Design a protein around this ligand. Structure first.
Ligand SMILES: C/C=C(\C)CC/C=C(\C)CCC=C(C)C
Ligand SMILES: C/C=C(\C)CC/C=C(\C)CCC=C(C)C
Lengths: 273, 273
């Protein structure tokens, strides 16, 4: 993670020795994307908004996948054979605001791989941590309420990096988009409903597994798909729609929240105590 | 139902011939409560707020129950042996705002029997009918969206009477308090969450049965109570608390609402969508 300005010779060890030890063709492509992304950050800064940690390896992954989705049955072209400029247009195309059209499996793989976050994701994760006593555990990482709530403020950039570190261990990029969506749903449930508050630690993976398992069960009732622990169907389901991904997650979060005390709140005092 | 001013001689048929044909000792006690309630309405009008249809037979029932809860193991005194004034103090005591202390089975039996409604119950039932296309069915009655939405306005007194007629067939008074609570919960879920809207008719009895069955299952996991279809435990559970009645009902309503389209809403357009 180059978090601070570094020398050409330190940056070179990071690319040819410290990070890429399996394929060095990756270091040339990653060097190609830093040059392309750097001018894109300078002249078109907003093609990279909602991105705070630009994972060049993950952005290259989004590009290899875009070549496969674009490719169709015909074999996908090798990003490596593509010309420096063709690699820049692939990047510019993947960075383009995902529009109505692509499979929601492709939208998720690109957004998750680019690590794009809905606006206010970081502020919304603060609001989830403020109303959760024991913290959020995602992919074996844990944002505990303290020392973060005590040492940080809502819009602190340091927090955005802690949220990004917490979601660091999410290996699969489409899972990062579902975890980013559970967190966006948990923020709407918590904000829309001010009475509910988490008792134990929120395991974002378990809320996602529970949502997929409900989807698995409901889709099974439609047509009994026999693929198991394959979330491809779940990822393709649109976020909002008749039975979309956002329903399953809201349900899971609400079952967890409702298993705990409902604090009587004064903003809209109950008409029933 | 005496909805309009009537003569002493018409009121007399209503009490000794038309309504009480099984025990006429009931007509003397009901006559006793109209005299007591009538001065209470005149001088202390708010001991009867949240009450629009004063069911004297149901209010006498609340009083016979208060004598049993007050009685303890020792046999409950016969309301009929009680002196006219002792019957007025029993009434004044049952009408007193239920305070923190009594079993939530007793709070419910008194409130349900007095037909007390949380403030704005009637306005909140309009809001449930406005966002439910095919209406609410309770105890074999149905508040359909039309002709009521078309012919009535939110604060119309005519609507309060239609809501009270719909909840008319609820024989058991504690069930009326749970149905009044499901309706209060459905109003908080619908209001807090503006995107969710009911697809089919809301059967308030089915939402209550599904909440009791979840409670039955969870309490069974604690201690396996063998009483079946006995809602006494559910009624005693406090409305809001660690696992209270309001959680089960919110859950049931949310499962029904989330089984339908989530209308994308513009007040807080989706950030992750
Ligand atoms: C962009 C995402 C949303 C607009 C959230 C959709 C809302 C729900 C699935 C129900 C939320 C319910 C609560 C009680 C908070
Ligand atoms: C007097 C009653 C209440 C204060 C309602 C309690 C709230 C819930 C049980 C959760 C509601 C959730 C929504 C998304 C509307």
């Amino acid at each position: 993670v180059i978090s601070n300005p570094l020398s050409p010779r330190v940056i070179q060890n990071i690319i040819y020795y410290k990070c890429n030890t399996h394929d060095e063709r990756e270091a040339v492509i990653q060097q190609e994307l830093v040059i392309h992304i750097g001018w894109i950050i300078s002249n078109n800064p907003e093609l990279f908004s909602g991105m705070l940690k630009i994972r060049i390896g993950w952005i290259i992954h989004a590009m290899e996948y875009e070549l496969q989705i674009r490719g169709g049955d015909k074999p996908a072209l090798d990003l490596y054979q593509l010309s420096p400029s063709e690699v820049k247009q692939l990047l510019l195309d993947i960075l383009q605001p995902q529009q109505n059209g692509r499979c929601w499996l492709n939208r998720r793989q690109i957004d998750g791989s680019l690590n794009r976050t809905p606006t206010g994701f970081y502020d919304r994760v603060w609001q989830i941590l403020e109303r959760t006593p024991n913290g959020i555990i995602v992919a074996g990482k844990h944002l505990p309420q303290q020392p973060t709530l005590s040492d940080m403020t809502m819009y602190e950039m340091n927090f955005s990096l802690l949220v990004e570190d917490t979601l660091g261990n999410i290996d699969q990029p489409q899972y990062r988009q579902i975890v980013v969506e559970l967190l966006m749903v948990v923020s709407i449930v918590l904000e829309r409903n001010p009475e509910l508050e988490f008792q134990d630690k929120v395991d974002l993976d378990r809320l996602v597994k529970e949502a997929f398992n409900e989807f698995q069960k409901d889709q099974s009732r439609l047509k009994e798909i026999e693929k198991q622990d394959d979330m491809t169907s779940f990822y393709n389901t649109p976020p909002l729609g008749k039975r979309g991904t956002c329903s399953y997650l809201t349900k899971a979060v609400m079952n967890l929240l409702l298993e705990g005390e409902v604090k009587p709140n004064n903003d809209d005092p109950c008409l029933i105590s």
